Amino acid sequence: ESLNEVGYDDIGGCRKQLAQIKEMVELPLRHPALFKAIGVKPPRGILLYGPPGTGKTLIARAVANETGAFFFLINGPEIMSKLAGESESNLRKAFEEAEKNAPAIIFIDELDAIAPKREKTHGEVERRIVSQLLTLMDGLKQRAHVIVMAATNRPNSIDPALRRFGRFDREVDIGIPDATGRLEILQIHTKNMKLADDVDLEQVANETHGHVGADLAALCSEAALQAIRKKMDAEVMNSLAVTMDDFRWALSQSNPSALRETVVEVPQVTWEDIGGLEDVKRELQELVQYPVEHPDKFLKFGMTPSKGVLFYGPPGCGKTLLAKAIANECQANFISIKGPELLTMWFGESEANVREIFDKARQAAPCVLFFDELDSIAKARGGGGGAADRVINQILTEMDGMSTKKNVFIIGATNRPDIIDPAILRPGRLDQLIYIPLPDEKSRVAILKANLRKSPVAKDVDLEFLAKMTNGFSGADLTEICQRACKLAIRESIESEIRRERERQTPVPEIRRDHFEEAMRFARRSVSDNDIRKYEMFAQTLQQSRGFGSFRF
Amino acid sequence: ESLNEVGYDDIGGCRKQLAQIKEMVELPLRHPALFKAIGVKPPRGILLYGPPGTGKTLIARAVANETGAFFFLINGPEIMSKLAGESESNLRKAFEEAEKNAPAIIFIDELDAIAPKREKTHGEVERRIVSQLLTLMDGLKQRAHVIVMAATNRPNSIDPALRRFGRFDREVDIGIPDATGRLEILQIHTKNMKLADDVDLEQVANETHGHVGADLAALCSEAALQAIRKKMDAEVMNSLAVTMDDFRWALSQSNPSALRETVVEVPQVTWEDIGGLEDVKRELQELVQYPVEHPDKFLKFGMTPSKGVLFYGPPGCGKTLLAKAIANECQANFISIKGPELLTMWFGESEANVREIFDKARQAAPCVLFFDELDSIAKARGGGGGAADRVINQILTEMDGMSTKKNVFIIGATNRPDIIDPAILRPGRLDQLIYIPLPDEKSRVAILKANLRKSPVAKDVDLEFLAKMTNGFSGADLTEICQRACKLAIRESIESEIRRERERQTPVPEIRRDHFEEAMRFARRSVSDNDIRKYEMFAQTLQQSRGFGSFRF
């Protein structure tokens, strides 16, 4: 009724995506007179594909309301609920009603329900509703000024005839709300929750991971009810204090759904967490930023931008936080495909779900498609074989497919660079290889400073001394130095509280440098001298300058 | 009629889960005025998923009755029983009836029947009743003060569109009744059974395993009929004496259904059944208790709590009773995933049934997810392969997926620590490894005392002498020392009864110390000196301190 009015301010979790919606379906609706005189063909379907509970209904209702177009809702399960032959009547009546109110927004939510994948559709009446929808979008694409968007979980779950042109051509990935998106969603949902000012709304927004807007509403709901069941007695009702302990309890008891849906997000590493690596930094800038931030020069000199690069080197030396950093300078959506995902695709024989990954990269462009641990499969069949894995081959196919445009950069990184498919290293594919060595003294002092950031560390601790002592230490070992110093600070502080409460009732404010000594006593240089030796042998396998130096004339 | 009134006292076998129901659907029903003034969004579906016959109908009816909400039941097979067209009419009639009695509890038991897995639904009417149920749950989520719970066997057997938000967002694992839960259920079902005071009601509650409340009712029933068929003649009917022999007979001929349904329970090991292992005990406290009992300290010093630990060591040295012990101090539910279960997933190619275990840990949080014998698969393909097994990779996937919140701790323990996936031991994954050695003198005297507990053992026998003579004996060797000493006492006692009855009619009160020589003659040190040698070699493989000792400045 009067509640649904929903506007742009009431929508959070999507800024670029909602702006994309506005540039798609507000100019040809608010002022279509300026539109068709040019001769430009209007969109006639905006297939909003995203995880469930992102409030896609609220998004489309806000876009319709702040345009004035008559938002008419077609509930999917409602259509499938009605008997055979009345669902087709309801669909045609819906489109006919919406062409009356000529600026209209038809929003067929749960398009999976009425029109799933064509192999799933079983009955003929369940194939006369998909067909009726198809002919409706054709006839209302060619006529009557109505624009029909729909909300789906994924773009394989829709009948492929709907993605054909004229029908649902456009797609908008509503996706997971990111950290600032979760901030906006918490502010909207906590407009009236009247916290006790202990809640940041920012720290919780950072430590909610895999939480769509419905999950954030559930989080605020359970936190408010923890406040209610903590008060436990009408004026005392208005004096409820939703304190940060309630939000931490709600987080500890929140079941999120948006995990296993990979998140595209500009990461926060800023090239100072990964210090050093200066020549690698220059190569990554020249490979990512220069194609996208200075693309005129590339088309001037005729150079095609490289499709991909391939890190390699010792494990846990700052390879993942070295593609996040360059995705942060590029301000590109960062898509990390971890090794277990590639392995899962290699074991289920579902080698066609990496088409979906590259497609998601295409929509989320510009990208840094960090195929982390690209040699997981080659380790998993160490040995009858020899090359060309199941899904490595599909990675090659969808890597050769996309053009040097669309600014999608694959930065797949391998611990073992020799067991990988040698067809990956062909030109056009991940031809540039970049050795990521063990941290240099600047690099590991930056690593030690970054791992100890947000942790209360002393002033008399000499972190450059630590970084100067540690030569062969990989980045992961330098984390485990700090995560055994923080852990021992935990032990000492808790033991302090324990012998205080049992005796003094009846503090270790910071990680003192005597914790960084007995924590450093358990220091394991995890990468051997024979691992980095082989990585150097592969590195100068890729160095065959050999006499063409001082090529003068 | 008047019989169904059922209350909280009449429900047993679930305290935390029933209290969760109290905090879910008792506050927003008795006093909803205190609720919606805050702006908190009410629950609108409580998917009570649990094994069949846990009295879920009785649970929902008791919660409604002690609330006053109009419990109205939608029997699943009743809906599927009516012909096509009026099953949907019965659904709409049910919802429109319950929105009249504005505080109401719809309880659609056997939601598997009306809405199974979406692939399983075959006819179109079986897909118009799920769709009708979906649109009804949407319309009654957004309106009419009414809340709709439904009992299922598992959360895979339900159509995935029901678990979407607005629809069945909440889930409650009613689960297996534990030992004290079985005590409560036994007392409820044995209120009027008028025992002979020989029945403990507690010992029988301990030795019924995998028994849901209906199985306990069947147990009391078969015991009562054994009393009836032991009496075998109206006043003699009132003088029936249900003696513990009847309960033992009924327990020996009870067919339980709740086996193969993994039980979550705070176990009973109390950390002195496994004596010794003091440094291991301190690491386990620092890893489990300190993250969950003192969690503000971790967020102060910025430490993310470690996701999991990996025991290793000689077989049967107290590794399972070393994770139950820490799950007991933590008061966390304990989920043991034995090696045959992982192997069963590796052979059936059902690598996606370990997603269900991690989900079960998430609902049953905080947990100790003891993947006992994590190297079952690697032993089962000892040898073209090399690493990264079918379901070990899925364990890595849903181990990396969940955050350091939710307090789910994985303690997967391996006899052979080198054949396991090296990707398990990466940081973030089961990074801590804890060698579990053969018992020391304190540890094996505690093992001997615990194995001989509840068994009548003499005073003159020195268990410190036994623990002092056994050096290379693993804990299992010490069990077969005591389970051959008990067995010799059995043999000698039964032989005494035999030679008494055949001659004296026509006692060995305890395990005397002259049986502990005959048992100890067959003393098998089952773990060799070259097995523990390899485990210590792996231990120093994990000890690479190497000169960073005496790190001063």
Numbering used by the authors:
A (entry chain A), B (entry chain B): 196 to 428, 439 to 588, 593 to 715, 727 to 773
The authors write:
Six p97 monomers form a functional complex, featuring a double-ring structure based on the association of D1 and D2. IBMPFD/ALS is a genetic disorder caused by a single amino acid mutation on the p97 ATPase, promoting ATPase activity and cofactor dysregulation.
The structural results revealed two major forms in the molecular population: the p97R155H dodecamer and the p97R155H hexamer-p47 complex. We reconstructed the 3D density maps of the p97R155H dodecamer complex at 3.34 Å resolution and the p97R155H-p47 complex at 4.30 Å. The two p97R155H hexamers are oppositely packed against their D2 rings with a D6 symmetrical arrangement. For p97R155H dodecamer, we did not find densities that could be assigned to p47. Our cryo-EM density map of the p97R155H dodecamer was able to show an apparent density of the partial C-terminal tail (residues Q764 to F773). The crystal structure of the C-terminus up to P774 of an engineered p97 variant has also been determined, but at a weak signal level. This is because in our p97R155H dodecamer, the C-terminal tail is sandwiched by the two hexameric D2 rings, limiting its mobility and allowing visualization of high-resolution details. Packing occurs via largely polar-polar interactions between the D2 α helices and a hydrogen-bonding network of the C-terminal residues (D749, E756, Q760, Q764, and R766). π-stacking forces between the aromatic side chains of the C-terminal tails and the D2 α helices (F674, F682, F768, F771 and F773) also contribute to the packing of the two p97R155H hexamers. In the absence of nucleotides, the p97R155H mutant prefers to form a higher-order p97R155H dodecamer, immobilizing C-terminal tails and prohibiting interaction of p47 cofactor with the NTD.
